[PDB]
Amino acid sequence: LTEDQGLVVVDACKAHTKATSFCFRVSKEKLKRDVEGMGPPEIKYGESLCFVQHVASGLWLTYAAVLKKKAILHQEGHMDDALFLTRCQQEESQAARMIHSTAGLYNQFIKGLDSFSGKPRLPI
């Protein structure tokens, strides 16, 4: 929840905890911690509906209105936003962080190609 914007993906260090302390709730009731402990199985994958909340603000997530609709945190929103969790296979999730560090590496390396491009005198 950016101060400027209130719901965007954003740089990891740039997103301080207060700016993004999201959590689910079983229902829209605004109304402890740490079993040590895998903990009680409160939330099913599949058919364990939970609604997004910015706990620091208490907003309930909702789409505004190609179907690439914007989603926005909001004080109320539609009742219909019955989000529910679903795990990826570990045949793919690895292929994602793999997307990531690799993408970071090649990006900064292209910055390194930019470092001497027109200017003659690098994670090689």
Consecutive H or E run containing 104 = helix 94-115
55: Cα within 13 Å, side-chain hemisphere: 8
Determine the length of the chain: 124
Q: How far is CA 34 from CA 20, 37, 104, in A?
A: 20, 8, 34
What approach was used to elucidate this structure?
Answer: cryo-EM
**Burial classification of residue 59, based on how many CB atoms lie within 10 Å of its CB (0-12 exposed, 13-18 middle, 19 or more buried):** buried
Q: Which residues contact 18 (CB under 8 A, 6 or more apart)?
A: 56
Q: After which residues is the chain discontinuous, taking C to N > 2.5 Å? A: 31, 65, 121
Q: Rounded to an integer, what distance in angstroms lies between the CA atom of residue 83 and that of residue 81? A: 6
DSSP three-state, residue 18: helix
Q: Rounded to an integer, what distance in angstroms lies between the CA atom of residue 44 and that of residue 102? A: 32
Say what the resolution is, in angstroms.
4.2
The token duo for 49 is 């509906």
1 near 59, Cβ under 8 Å?
yes
